[PDB]
Amino acid sequence: ATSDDWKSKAIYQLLTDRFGRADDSTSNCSNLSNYCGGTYEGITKHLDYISGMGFDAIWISPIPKNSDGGYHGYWATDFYQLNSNFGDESQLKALIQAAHERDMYVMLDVVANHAGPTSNGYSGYTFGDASLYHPKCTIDYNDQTSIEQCWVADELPDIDTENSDNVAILNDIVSGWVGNYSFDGIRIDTVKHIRKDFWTGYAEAAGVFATGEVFNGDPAYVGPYQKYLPSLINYPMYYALNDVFVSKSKGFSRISEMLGSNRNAFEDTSVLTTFVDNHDNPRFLNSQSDKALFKNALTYVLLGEGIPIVYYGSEQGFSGGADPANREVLWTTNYDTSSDLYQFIKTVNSVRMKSNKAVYMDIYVGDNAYAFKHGDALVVLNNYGSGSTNQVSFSVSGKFDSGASLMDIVSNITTTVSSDGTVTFNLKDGLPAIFTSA
Ligand SMILES: *[C@@H]1O[C@H](CO)[C@@H](O)[C@H](O)[C@H]1NC(C)=O
Ligand SMILES: [Ca+2]
């Protein structure tokens, strides 16, 4: 599927090892650093749980055979063999067919930069001897040559992407994964760790929409990558959202400033993928346990500028910290669709799905409150947190008619635009508000 096809989607990011199994067990996993037993069949069994929340795309773990302990898929050995932990060809195709029957997209995570660590040599690996990898070195994160030539985590064999045989093989691998399985898009791992010009050829080989992971918070660093890939993961907005909602070290001017910095660094901000947590960073609720702040952040993710990504287990209030504690098994929850955050996400996705897709950011930039439009809906965020009944007030002159009746989808709140265009109302429990006009 194309960039334009993906612009309207909202992605549920899951770890294949951690989402679901064929069995109905709610037992915890005793070691989150090794395989817990999640499978493709486990995702198929629970697709209705995911679509029930209003997601219409999933991003799954990399699929190839991995080195020991590579439950996350990022440590490939033989790129042309499936990881048998997750299932076989038939089970992966049955998942993609089940998703497609539900009009859901499937996005494959892909690695070109590295293989899994060695304990001996490279027997069994697609890149089957030391000469096919860059010499081992540690990354100097001030030196882009070091970032590209040296080994991730000091330990992941860095494929020699300047060997043209290796480039042709990497392009063949991603063309085959996408073509053989009819994936609709890819999420590209470790983009900053290979020279930019590689990515043109690799994404063309894949032949579908790609969102690249450039793990850096600076728009001036990430933005230039959109010359080479059609979308990047919005790490710069992730840091702004965390400043406003998790530490409250900035007011909402930080989100307004970051929208402007992204407009100045990126060709097309509308296709960047928005998120507030993921598998590489502590969950939101680890640092900031206030679920009203989480709900405000999730509202930004789902309705603000960009393509939303929500990390699995957000809807069950998961609160684990540093990797792998943030990679909890979902089945302890028994896929409870009555969970407050599941019903919240379903509510917000119903706005997303069914409103015009025109987003107008920065209707109001306050210190502790903020408003924007998502289609016809007026979205109001705040960082006062749980228990707040603070007043929020701002002008909507020329955006909503004077005297217009606004009704909040989240809480009971009804408010009338004043005779001169001002919206003024009290929060309920610090919750986001999503107003429509009568
Ligand atoms: C794609 O399928 C072809 C036909 O079996 C096979 O030769 C190729 O290895 C497959 N590619 C991958 C990356 O699985
Ligand atoms: Ca590299």
Side-chain angles (χ1 to χ4, degrees):
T2 63
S3 304
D4 285 349
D5 289 342
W6 274 97
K7 279 180 189 174
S8 61
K9 303 300 180 189
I11 301 163
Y12 183 86
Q13 177 199 352
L14 63 84
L15 266 56
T16 304
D17 185 53
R18 306 294 156 103
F19 177 78
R21 331 149 58 88
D23 74 34
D24 292 338
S25 198
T26 65
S27 303
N28 199 11
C29 169
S30 43
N31 181 10
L32 292 186
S33 295
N34 206 349
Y35 288 97
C36 290
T39 66
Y40 302 130
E41 280 194 341
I43 307 161
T44 301
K45 184 171 141 229
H46 296 288
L47 279 173
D48 289 359
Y49 169 90
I50 301 174
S51 65
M53 265 184 288
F55 296 101
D56 55 14
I58 58 173
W59 153 19
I60 71 171
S61 300
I63 65 175
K65 188 175 201 295
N66 264 225
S67 64
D68 289 348
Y71 67 81
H72 42 65
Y74 294 117
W75 295 351
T77 57
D78 184 345
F79 282 89
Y80 285 94
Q81 285 203 6
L82 295 173
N83 185 349
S84 67
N85 284 281
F86 302 158
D88 63 20
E89 175 180 342
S90 176
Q91 288 166 329
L92 180 54
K93 288 199 169 175
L95 163 58
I96 293 166
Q97 167 181 38
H100 286 170
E101 283 295 342
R102 287 164 194 58
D103 293 336
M104 294 171 84
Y105 287 174
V106 189
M107 174 171 276
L108 177 64
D109 204 329
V110 303
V111 180
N113 178 70
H114 60 264
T118 53
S119 41
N120 294 103
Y122 294 105
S123 185
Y125 285 56
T126 296
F127 302 104
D129 74 264
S131 74
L132 298 180
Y133 299 90
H134 293 145
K136 189 168 175 171
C137 40
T138 188
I139 295 168
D140 171 358
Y141 274 101
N142 290 327
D143 174 355
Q144 188 57 30
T145 294
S146 190
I147 294 172
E148 297 170 2
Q149 292 296 307
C150 293
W151 288 27
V152 169
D154 282 339
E155 69 163 352
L156 306 183
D158 201 63
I159 296 163
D160 182 7
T161 50
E162 296 63 65
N163 175 322
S164 55
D165 284 355
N166 286 350
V167 171
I169 293 163
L170 288 169
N171 290 166
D172 182 74
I173 290 164
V174 72
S175 181
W177 281 331
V178 172
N180 290 0
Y181 291 99
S182 294
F183 287 106
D184 306 293
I186 60 176
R187 176 273 191 181
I188 304 183
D189 194 59
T190 40
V191 172
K192 77 188 185 175
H193 296 288
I194 306 179
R195 59 190 172 83
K196 280 164 171 163
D197 282 348
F198 172 86
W199 294 114
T200 301
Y202 187 81
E204 284 156 18
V208 296
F209 177 71
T211 196
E213 182 220 8
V214 176
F215 198 165
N216 188 291
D218 189 348
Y221 184 98
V222 180
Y225 286 87
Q226 206 176 33
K227 174 171 178 298
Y228 302 91
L229 292 174
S231 171
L232 290 311
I233 289 169
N234 199 346
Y235 260 105
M237 188 53 80
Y238 163 85
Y239 293 111
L241 286 167
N242 274 86
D243 291 346
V244 173
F245 293 115
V246 173
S247 291
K248 324 154 107 247
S249 59
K250 298 295 168 182
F252 277 93
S253 59
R254 181 51 64 131
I255 286 170
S256 175
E257 290 161 1
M258 190 62 74
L259 284 165
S261 297
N262 280 354
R263 182 176 73 248
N264 274 287
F266 291 93
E267 197 161 328
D268 182 7
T269 58
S270 76
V271 299
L272 308 181
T273 45
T274 321
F275 65 106
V276 74
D277 66 16
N278 64 24
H279 60 304
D280 286 322
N281 294 273
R283 290 193 182 250
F284 183 110
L285 290 172
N286 185 260
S287 295
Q288 179 53 261
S289 69
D290 183 329
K291 287 190 175 82
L293 293 170
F294 192 32
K295 284 175 177 176
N296 277 274
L298 288 169
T299 304
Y300 186 94
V301 168
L302 288 162
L303 297 183
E305 166 81 347
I307 296 171
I309 311 185
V310 172
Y311 184 49
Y312 85 101
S314 294
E315 73 279 5
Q316 302 298 335
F318 282 2
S319 59
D323 166 23
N326 60 343
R327 307 170 180 189
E328 307 98 317
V329 298
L330 189 60
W331 51 80
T332 58
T333 72
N334 205 32
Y335 309 87
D336 177 8
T337 62
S338 71
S339 293
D340 189 74
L341 283 164
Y342 183 105
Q343 289 299 316
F344 179 75
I345 286 164
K346 182 184 174 176
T347 288
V348 177
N349 265 323
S350 285
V351 179
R352 179 192 67 78
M353 278 188 296
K354 300 309 278 180
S355 301
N356 200 3
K357 30 257 198 303
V359 173
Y360 196 99
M361 303 304 301
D362 282 11
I363 293 294
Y364 166 57
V365 187
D367 186 23
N368 306 288
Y370 181 80
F372 66 96
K373 275 189 81 196
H374 182 111
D376 40 4
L378 178 64
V379 184
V380 183
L381 306 184
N382 77 94
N383 72 352
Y384 294 108
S386 282
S388 174
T389 57
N390 279 85
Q391 188 179 74
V392 173
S393 186
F394 56 92
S395 183
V396 297
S397 294
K399 283 85 170 60
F400 293 84
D401 302 335
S402 292
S405 152
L406 301 175
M407 294 84 58
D408 172 30
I409 299 183
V410 178
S411 297
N412 184 17
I413 303 170
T414 52
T415 201
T416 303
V417 177
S418 74
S419 54
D420 70 347
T422 302
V423 165
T424 304
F425 73 94
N426 294 274
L427 294 165
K428 292 203 172 197
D429 182 48
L431 289 167
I434 306 169
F435 294 102
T436 66
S437 62

